[PDB]
Amino acid sequence: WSSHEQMLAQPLKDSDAEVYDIIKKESNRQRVGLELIASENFASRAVLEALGSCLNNKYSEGYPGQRYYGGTEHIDELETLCQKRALQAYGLDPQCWGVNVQPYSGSPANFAVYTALVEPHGRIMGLDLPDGGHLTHGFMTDKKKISATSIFFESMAYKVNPDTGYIDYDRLEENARLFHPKLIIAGTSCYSRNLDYGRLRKIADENGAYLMADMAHISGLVVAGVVPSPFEHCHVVTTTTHKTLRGCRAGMIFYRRGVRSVDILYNLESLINSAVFPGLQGGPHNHAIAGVAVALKQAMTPEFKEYQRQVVANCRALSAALVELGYKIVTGGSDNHLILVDLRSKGTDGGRAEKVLEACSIACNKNTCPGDKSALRPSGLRLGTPALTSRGLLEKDFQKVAHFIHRGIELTVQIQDDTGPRATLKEFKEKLAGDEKHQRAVRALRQEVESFAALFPLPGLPGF
Amino acid sequence: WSSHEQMLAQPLKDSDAEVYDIIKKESNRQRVGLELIASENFASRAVLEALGSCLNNKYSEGYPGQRYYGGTEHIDELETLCQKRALQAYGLDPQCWGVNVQPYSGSPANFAVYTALVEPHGRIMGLDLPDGGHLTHGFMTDKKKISATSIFFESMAYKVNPDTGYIDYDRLEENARLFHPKLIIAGTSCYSRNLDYGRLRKIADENGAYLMADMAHISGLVVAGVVPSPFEHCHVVTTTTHKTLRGCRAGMIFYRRGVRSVDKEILYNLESLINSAVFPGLQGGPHNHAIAGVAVALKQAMTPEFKEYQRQVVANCRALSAALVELGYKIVTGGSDNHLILVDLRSKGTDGGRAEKVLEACSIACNKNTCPGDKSALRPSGLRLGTPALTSRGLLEKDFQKVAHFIHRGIELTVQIQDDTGPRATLKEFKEKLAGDEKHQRAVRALRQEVESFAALFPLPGLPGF
Numbered sequence: 001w002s003s004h005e006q007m008l009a010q011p012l013k014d015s016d017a018e019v020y021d022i023i024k025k026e027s028n029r030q031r032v033g034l035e036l037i038a039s040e041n042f043a044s045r046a047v048l049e050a051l052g053s054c055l056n057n058k059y060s061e062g063y064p065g066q067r068y069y070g071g072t073e074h075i076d077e078l079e080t081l082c083q084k085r086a087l088q089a090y091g092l093d094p095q096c097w098g099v100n101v102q103p104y105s106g107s108p109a110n111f112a113v114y115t116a117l118v119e120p121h122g123r124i125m126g127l128d129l130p131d132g133g134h135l136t137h138g139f140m141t142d143k144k145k146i147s148a149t150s151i152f153f154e155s156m157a158y159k160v161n162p163d164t165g166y167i168d169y170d171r172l173e174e175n176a177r178l179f180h181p182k183l184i185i186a187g188t189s190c191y192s193r194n195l196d197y198g199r200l201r202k203i204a205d206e207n208g209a210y211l212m213a214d215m216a217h218i219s220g221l222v223v224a225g226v227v228p229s230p231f232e233h234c235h236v237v238t239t240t241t242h243k244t245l246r247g248c249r250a251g252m253i254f255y256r257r258g259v260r261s262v263d264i265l266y267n268l269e270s271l272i273n274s275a276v277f278p279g280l281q282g283g284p285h286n287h288a289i290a291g292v293a294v295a296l297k298q299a300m301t302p303e304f305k306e307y308q309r310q311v312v313a314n315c316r317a318l319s320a321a322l323v324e325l326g327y328k329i330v331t332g333g334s335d336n337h338l339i340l341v342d343l344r345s346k347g348t349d350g351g352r353a354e355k356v357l358e359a360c361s362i363a364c365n366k367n368t369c370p371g372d373k374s375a376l377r378p379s380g381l382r383l384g385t386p387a388l389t390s391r392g393l394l395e396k397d398f399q400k401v402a403h404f405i406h407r408g409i410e411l412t413v414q415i416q417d418d419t420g421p422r423a424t425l426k427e428f429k430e431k432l433a434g435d436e437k438h439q440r441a442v443r444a445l446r447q448e449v450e451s452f453a454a455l456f457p458l459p460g461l462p463g464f
Numbered sequence: 465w466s467s468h469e470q471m472l473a474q475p476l477k478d479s480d481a482e483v484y485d486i487i488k489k490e491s492n493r494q495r496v497g498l499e500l501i502a503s504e505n506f507a508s509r510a511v512l513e514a515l516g517s518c519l520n521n522k523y524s525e526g527y528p529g530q531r532y533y534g535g536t537e538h539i540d541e542l543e544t545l546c547q548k549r550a551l552q553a554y555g556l557d558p559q560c561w562g563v564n565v566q567p568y569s570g571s572p573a574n575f576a577v578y579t580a581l582v583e584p585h586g587r588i589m590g591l592d593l594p595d596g597g598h599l600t601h602g603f604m605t606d607k608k609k610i611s612a613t614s615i616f617f618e619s620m621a622y623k624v625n626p627d628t629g630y631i632d633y634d635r636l637e638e639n640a641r642l643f644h645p646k647l648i649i650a651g652t653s654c655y656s657r658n659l660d661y662g663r664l665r666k667i668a669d670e671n672g673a674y675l676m677a678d679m680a681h682i683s684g685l686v687v688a689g690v691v692p693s694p695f696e697h698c699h700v701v702t703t704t705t706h707k708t709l710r711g712c713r714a715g716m717i718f719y720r721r722g723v724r725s726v727d728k729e730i731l732y733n734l735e736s737l738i739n740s741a742v743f744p745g746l747q748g749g750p751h752n753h754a755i756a757g758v759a760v761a762l763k764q765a766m767t768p769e770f771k772e773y774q775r776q777v778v779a780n781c782r783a784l785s786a787a788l789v790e791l792g793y794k795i796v797t798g799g800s801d802n803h804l805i806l807v808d809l810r811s812k813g814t815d816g817g818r819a820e821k822v823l824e825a826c827s828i829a830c831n832k833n834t835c836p837g838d839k840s841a842l843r844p845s846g847l848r849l850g851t852p853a854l855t856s857r858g859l860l861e862k863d864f865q866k867v868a869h870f871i872h873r874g875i876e877l878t879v880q881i882q883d884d885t886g887p888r889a890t891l892k893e894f895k896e897k898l899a900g901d902e903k904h905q906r907a908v909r910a911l912r913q914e915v916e917s918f919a920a921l922f923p924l925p926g927l928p929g930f
């Protein structure tokens with residue numbers, strides 16, 4: 001009749017032309033650019049197929065033991081499988097650790113941990129945004145509470161030294177005695193080094209606070225064994241299932257379960273599960289949990305372990321190649337997948353550079369460097385190797401890359417001379433758009449990057 | 465070269481055999497059962513293909529105007545398209561309404577509004593859980609603050625008349641005068657009737673509170689024009705993009721923008737507060753594939769085919785009501801203005817607890833709910849039945865008459881085990897007797913073998929074999 005209603009069978013490319021091209025376009029913008037954004041990566045066809053399944057269609061509100069609905073014989077099979085793969089892939093005795101796989105992304109998971117362990121107005125210490133922390137580790141101004149984490153809990157930042165780039169731990173341990181936090185966060189969004197979880201545990205225990213690691217950026221490296229495991233000192237560990245773990249967007253919270261002390265058990269499990277549900281979320285996204293389960297399988301495999309070993313080495317290559325060209329790397333080096341490039345040695349800033357490199361189809365982002373005084377004119381560049389390593393690039397290809405980046409910095413500087421010394425940014429950006437002189441080089445530099453990029457592959461479903 | 469590690473091109477059926485079967489099993493459990501859970505539905509292949517795309521791979525932190533990263537020409541094209549489809553599908557002048565499209569789901573969308581407009585410890589009022597409200601509308605008891613809504617904010621509930629099953633608006637107006645809510649919630653999870661948004665606006669205004677509608681359950685019906693629009697009285701309206709809108713799991717927040725009232729003249733400020741609460745306040749990077757699906761689902765929602773499916777959904781409900789009323793069941797408000805009904809199983813001598821399980825075992829899905837009059841949330845007397853999911857598989861009035869009949873058989877059966885169980889018997893007992901007795905297991909198998917035969921006669925929306 002009008003029961004043409006089986007438009008439900010109709011495929012996207014025919015149902016929504018507008019959305020189809022957008023996908024076809026983006027997936028192409030990916031194939032030709034160089035992704036150096038540390039938090040980016042490319043999920044496998046496998047993980048990606050799970051997201052489109054009919055598991056979207058099931059409401060499984062509660063947990064595998066206790067659910068609020070019924071046709072859940074399979075969603076329980078699934079969620080359990082995922083919890084088991086998670087604890088396995090990080091090699092955790094389930095008689096010591098548990099895992100919640102329901103958080104929707106990194107952020108919710110973090111939050112849910114605060115709700116659970118810290119309470120409304122309890123204190124949190126996180127590394128400052130400019131010194132390398134995340135928005136969810138608290139973030140204020142003398143005027144406003146930006147991040148929900150500073151709106152509902154009382155937060156305080158601990159900073160890195162402004163000459164080493166290193167977290168000043170003697171400071172943290174001194175202020176924590178004065179601030180009295182209920183939880184210390186150990187995790188970063190832009191830090192080249194391994195965190196001393198051992199010392200942090202000391203500081204936490206001396207205050208009767210929980211040590212929480214947010215290993216979102218290094219989760220992949222930790223599965224492989226490349227960087228040291230946080231699990232040895234922390235009571236809780238949250239993580240995205242997608243930055244270097246290379247899954248789809250989701251989050252997990254790992255918590256300790258078992259014994260704790262003199263003459264007493266952990267209670268972490270029930271508090272954290274409750275906070276995620278019914279505390280904060282609604283029905284779990286089962287297709288998401290599927291992809292996470294898939295990605296955890298692939299992560300245990302030795303092919304992942306090699307990709308993760310490649311990732312770090314690709315970073316040492318890129319560092320050296322740039323060091324050799326006169327660039328300063330912030331802590332002098334890196335223990336993992338990223339580097340903080342200080343562009344003050346080349347006479348420019350990360351604000352300007354970021355834009356010129358962007359126009360050349362090279363992606364990265366600006367970041368403040370330890371010493372900076374003005375988050376308005378940031379001096380750094382955050383470069384990471386995960387996404388490009390997933391497309392195959394081995395060291396020699398990254399030397400190729402270091403060179404393109406260099407050209408781009410040279411380019412940004414030409415525009416910084418030809419712009420004037422008291423030049424606003426709206427200007428610099430204007431001149432990069434209108435001046436034909438410049439457009440020529442930019443266009444040339446780009447035509448050169450995309451072709452280099454098209455050589456390696458782009459993971460994903462049929463073409464996209 | 466271990467660099468043959470391109471296990472990244474390798475398909476699921478080959479890469480994860482364990483998860484493949486789990487998907488193949490569930491998608492099958494779906495084809496043979498009768499889904500009567502009101503919040504469930506089946507998304508189209510179209511909406512479902514968008515979820516698997518490369519859009520997953522992009523980080524687009526900020527908003528279309530100001531993002532924090534760069535390769536976003538397309539994500540902006542997309543997010544805008546979605547915002548436009550949304551305002552369009554509900555027929556809203558974009559000079560009067562804006563839409564945030566990044567909530568990861570209904571729950572977080574509500575939380576963001578409360579975070580933006582009510583602030584920490586600000587007062588909120590919503591319908592009580594057992595009276596048909598939703599968890600996120602606040603939920604607390606004598607000992608614990610259970611929902612996060614009632615942890616960070618201070619909530620107090622309003623209830624339905626227990627002799628009528630209708631919201632008692634008189635009490636809500638009285639109580640609001642003493643409680644001073646900063647925001648009143650107008651939305652339900654299990655309510656057969658239209659909410660008088662008009663009167664709720666008059667109570668909100670009298671108190672200088674915001675009227676927020678959470679139309680999650682009825683969003684589909686509202687796009688078709690079946691039930692009346694909340695948009696005519698509320699300052700903000702949140703909704704899932706998946707209950708009766710039939711999309712993927714995500715959420716949206718609609719807010720007023722323009723001039724709110726004059727002395728000069730003061731504008732709404734709703735937009736910037738809301739947007740900021742969503743980001744960078746609460747969430748991280750948007751899920752672009754999810755947004756793609758929502759955009760797809762909204763285009764399908766404007767089409768007259770959706771409008772006909774939505775008109776069918778309501779009628780299928782009237783069919784299911786009557787068929788059941790005719791068998792002696794008491795429908796809670798006596799009827800329904802939408803997609804669901806709250807069945808009172810006290811007239812058949814049993815409860816929602818036991819029934820739910822028997823019907824479950826017979827491949828018939830629904831869930832228990834307290835009825836207005838109930839005193840014991842462990843002994844709920846009701847059944848929430850909804851028509852959306854089965855209407856998406858084609859069932860018409862007449863098919864629902866046979867459904868009504870299967871449900872009936874199942875209640876008769878639950879009663880057989882309740883009698884053959886003893887009166888002072890426990891749910892652990894009832895559930896175990898339903899499992900060990902072959903006497904019972906026979907009927908159950910027979911009734912099940914019969915439901916599946918019936919369900920298989922209908923299509924099941926979804927992408928290929930998965």
Ligand SMILES: *Cc1c(COP(=O)(O)O)cnc(C)c1O
Nearest residue numbers: 282283569570571598652653680
């Ligand atoms: C289900 C529902 C929600 C919550 O959505 P989730 O996607 O489960 O987080 C919010 N409001 C109402 C009215 C609902 O029925």
Ligand SMILES: *Cc1c(COP(=O)(O)O)cnc(C)c1O
Nearest residue numbers: 105106107134188189216748749
């Ligand atoms: C990116 C990131 C997150 C947040 O993940 P979203 O999905 O973007 O919410 C959390 N923690 C750290 C340390 C991160 O880098």
